[PDB]
Design a protein around this nucleic acid. Structure first.
Lengths: 102, 273, 244, 169
RNA sequence: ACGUACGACCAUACCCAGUGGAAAGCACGGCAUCCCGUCCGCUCUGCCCUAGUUAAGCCACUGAGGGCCCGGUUAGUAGUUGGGUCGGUGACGACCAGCGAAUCCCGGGUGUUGUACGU
RNA sequence: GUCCUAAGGGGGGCUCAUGGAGAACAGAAAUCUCCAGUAGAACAAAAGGGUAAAAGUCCCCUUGAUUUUGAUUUUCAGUGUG
């Protein structure tokens, strides 16, 4: 089985958020069967997950540490709104030469 | 006045079901599974240790949204197949159970078609990483030399990486900040039970026969405890998946379904009630 | 802030250049269906770490008055909100609300299809560990509209809901679950929320072969009423503070 | 089902309390009496609130109590019943199987009189149980005690009459 | 189907009482030398699983009183806003719509479920 | 006119106000035991849903009274190891 899919419009990726955007249309079949509906949805999900794994394993640098095999992702680029706007009891004793409390 | 009125029952807030049953520390569990030093999205393993009156339960547990999942399990009654027949709830049986769990995890993972993403993105400058997990023993209070640390010590000796200190092993001294290896080795091969056997036989023979009636009946001696325990550890490390058959009555799963359905009490219907 | 714990909580609630992960509040109205409550429990399952839940009924209509939302957002330090309610006109509604400076930024209603809703308990597969963030896949022609519309609004809201905690590095073992949202441009289009578990197989090359299996809830949504933010406060919301 | 030997009544604990009401030497001498009677170190009890009319203050030690158990409990409770001549009252018994009495002289208990210590009163109370009290006291899986296992006032009176051959009036 | 150990919902699961529990498992229990902690081996800890028992815990069922959880009813109704239609000095008179209650009433119920090991 | 190893932190144990029944002095109010006890006490805040095997109250340890580094923010520096 091939590990690369072909579509008329290429995918767009945001590896900081692990986000893959598919601008190609999802031709949902006009049938009343849930089995063929979920099979088509899984096939689109299969293509989306395949291009996400291929992009992460080829465009991100790989470092093998003791924690595990880690991929250093780019910073996120999708614009998201923020949640908040941008911004004594101590004296000295002369006759003993020490410190003691009151 | 009656405090348990309609107002008290209306605003009554029940706790969690396992918290009412006194089995789960939900404060410690939340810190266990929702907190991590790193944010690499890696799965986390917890070694669950539980102690009953006649058995020791060691499990390899992953926490999911719908419920926990068990990776591997070792038991003190499976030690009967490994030659350990008495003292199934002491420190030595706990350490052997933790060693058995460690060998079963490594044998299941292959560290003793579908393939992982780690093998797909493996670099040539990469080595085998030890299996890492944290300890969870629940609500049991633990002093120095507790048996749950024997499960920790057995799992760490088997090859499971558990981050830990040595301040609670048997033989540790708080004043000198040192651990006595001879006392620990004495606990490893069951010398504390052997010393109790010799002390009781010298002092109170009637109490010695009552406490250790199974040892005398099966001819298990105090001096042979070290040889018996060490042979059990070798057999655990050799065959981690030896099958055990108990002396309980054995039936199929469908036969236990039919037997309990005969002894079950059916709920009364609406017409009957 | 004489108390040290109260001072630490005030500093945590204080605005920062690098913001904390967002907290979502799950609150239930006076009348709510059990399907909406099960959908609320399913959405809480993917976000157990960064969410708080209310257990009583609230006499709140979000599109009429949202003063109680601003009071709950200020008290609980929650910027995201999921609101569940039921009605004769709207049988199952999930009102997603996003807040900014303890004020209502934008809200959107999600009409859930009752006959096609399957829960996580109805799918007998291996589930996601608690605390692990899933990857996101958005497909369809409704997300690339030149004008800001409800589908782009729902895309940004679903991204913020499943964002989790940011990290510069990630393990390869934490790439086993994916959240798929499908919505196509056009009578009303159906927004379908799908979550899958990912299995990898040998394909004879360096790149693995990806296989999927249904894990999460099978949710079908139709977009309804939408409240767009004021552009002056919207501009302040998208102001990107430079990290020191 | 009452024939079961684990429904047999037995002493849970026996608490001996001396309330001098004032800290100082009198509390220390009362602590020495309780230590001599039992053989274990005593407990210093502080007052919860401050009332000016009684000479007490908050966080001020006013009472000393010692809980005596084991076979030492039956021999001390026997000493208390020897002072009281094995005679008690129905109003002394509680509703949950526990009972006790108050005496005024530990000299009558069997302790030789010392002028450096003196004579102090005592409050005796014996708590009763059946086997099964570990369920309500254990840390893990703590629960409540069922109604049929709870001791009634009639059962502990019948136990007191049968064991110590006493009289309840 | 039952029990145990981790759990998900977190009262349909809670408060009180009664009845029963085959098998195994939990559980009560027996002893304080060692590890350990207390005023007290109550708790915790250490040893025993041998001896006694389902009395309690636990589970199942039942019973009253509440409480709690659903669906219809209320009702697209009160209430709150817009829109004009002519009249009403005007307010508004009704009308069209957008949202959208609650009390009361009726009917049903008093826990499901994931993994692992056993019976 | 006396007494105070300061606060804080972590861990462990316990449940409070009040009411009823009782007990030599002890009698509305001194001390102890049992039961009922959603908090009706206390600690903080100013809930329109704060806290109950705790955020309350008692024990163990720390009391070290403001630790170190940073090519990174902001400000300052004719005394720029900043």
């Amino acid at each position: 089985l091939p590990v690369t899919v072909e579509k008329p419009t290429p995918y767009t990726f945001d590896l900081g958020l692990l986000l893959a955007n598919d601008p190609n249309p999802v031709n949902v079949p006009k049938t009343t069967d849930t089995q063929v509906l979920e099979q088509h949805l899984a096939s689109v999900a299969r293509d989306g997950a395949q291009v996400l794994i291929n992009q992460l394993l080829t465009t991100t640098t790989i470092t093998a540490t003791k924690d595990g095999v880690l991929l250093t992702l780019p910073p996120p680029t999708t614009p998201l709104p923020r949640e908040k706007p941008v911004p004594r009891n101590l004296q000295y004793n002369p006759t003993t030469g020490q410190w003691e409390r009151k | 006045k009656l405090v348990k009125n309609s107002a008290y029952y209306s605003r009554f807030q029940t706790k969690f079901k396992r918290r009412r049953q006194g089995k789960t520390d939900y404060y410690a569990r939340k810190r266990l599974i929702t907190q991590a030093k790193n944010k690499y999205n890696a799965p986390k393993y917890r070694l669950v240790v539980r102690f009953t009156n006649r058995d020791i339960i060691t499990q390899m547990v992953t926490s999911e949204i719908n419920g926990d999942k068990i990776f591997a399990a070792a038991y003190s009654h499976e030690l009967r197949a490994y030659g350990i027949n008495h003292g199934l709830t002491n420190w030595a049986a706990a350490y052997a159970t933790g060693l058995l769990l460690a060998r079963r995890v490594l044998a299941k993972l292959g560290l003793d078609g579908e393939y992982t993403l780690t093998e797909a993105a493996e670099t040539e400058d990469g080595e085998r990483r030890p299996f890492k997990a944290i300890l969870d023993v629940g609500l049991a209070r633990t002093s120095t030399g507790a048996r749950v640390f024997g499960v920790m010590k057995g799992a760490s000796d088997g090859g499971i990486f558990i981050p830990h200190s040595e301040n609670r092993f048997p033989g540790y001294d708080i004043e000198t900040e040192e651990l006595d290896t001879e006392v620990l080795k004495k606990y490893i091969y069951g010398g504390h039970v052997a010393e109790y056997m010799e002390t009781l036989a010298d002092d109170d023979e009637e109490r010695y026969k009552s406490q250790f009636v199974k040892y005398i009946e099966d001819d298990v001696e105090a001096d042979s405890l070290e040889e018996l325990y060490a042979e059990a550890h070798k057999q655990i490390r050799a065959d981690p998946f030896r099958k055990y058959v108990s002396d309980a009555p054995k039936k199929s799963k469908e036969e236990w379904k039919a037997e309990s359905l005969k002894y079950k009490k059916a709920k009364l219907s609406r017409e009957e009630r | 802030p004489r108390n040290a714990r109260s001072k630490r909580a005030l500093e945590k609630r204080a605005p920062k250049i690098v913001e904390n992960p967002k907290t979502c509040l799950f609150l239930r109205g006076t009348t709510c269906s059990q399907i909406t409550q099960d959908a609320m429990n399913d959405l809480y399952a993917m976000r157990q770490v960064h969410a708080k839940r209310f257990h009583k009924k609230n006499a709140i209509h979000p599109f009429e008055d949202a003063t109680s939302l601003c009071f709950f957002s200020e008290k609980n330090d929650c910027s995201l909100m999921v609101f569940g309610s039921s009605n004769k006109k709207r049988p199952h509604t999930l009102t997603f609300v996003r807040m900014f400076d303890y004020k209502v930024l934008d809200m959107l209603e999600f009409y859930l299809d009752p006959d096609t809703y399957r829960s996580i308990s109805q799918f007998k597969t291996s589930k996601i560990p608690i605390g692990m963030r899933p990857m996101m896949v958005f497909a369809g022609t409704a997300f690339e509209s030149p004008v800001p519309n409800a589908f782009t609004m729902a895309k940004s809201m679903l991204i913020d809901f499943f964002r989790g905690e940011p990290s510069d590095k990630i393990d390869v073992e934490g790439l086993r679950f994916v959240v798929v949202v499908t919505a196509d441009e056009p009578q009303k289009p159906i927004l379908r929320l799908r979550v899958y578990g990912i299995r990898t197989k040998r394909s004879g090359t360096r790149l693995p072969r990806v296989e999927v299996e249904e894990h999460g809830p099978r949710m079908d949504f139709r977009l309804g009423r939408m409240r767009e933010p004021d552009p002056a406060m919207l501009k302040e919301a998208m102001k990107k503070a430079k990290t020191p | 089902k009452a024939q079961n030997p684990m429904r047999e009544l037995r002493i849970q604990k026996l608490v001996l309390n001396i309330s001098v009401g004032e800290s100082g030497d009198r509390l220390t001498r009362a602590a020495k009496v309780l230590e001599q009677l039992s053989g274990q170190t005593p407990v210093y009890s502080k007052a919860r609130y401050t009332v000016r009319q009684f000479g007490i203050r908050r966080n001020e030690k006013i009472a000393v109590h010692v809980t005596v158990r084991g076979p030492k409990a039956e021999e001390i409770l026997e000493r208390g019943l020897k002072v009281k001549e094995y005679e008690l009252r129905r109003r002394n018994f509680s509703e949950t199987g526990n009972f006790g009495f108050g005496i005024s002289e530990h000299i009558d208990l069997g302790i030789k009189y010392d002028p450096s210590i003196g004579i102090y009163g005592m409050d005796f109370y014996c708590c009763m149980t059946r086997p099964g009290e570990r369920v309500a006291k254990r840390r893990r899986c703590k629960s409540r005690i069922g109604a049929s296992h709870r001791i009634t006032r009639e059962e502990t009176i019948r136990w007191f009459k049968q064991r110590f051959d006493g009289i309840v009036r």
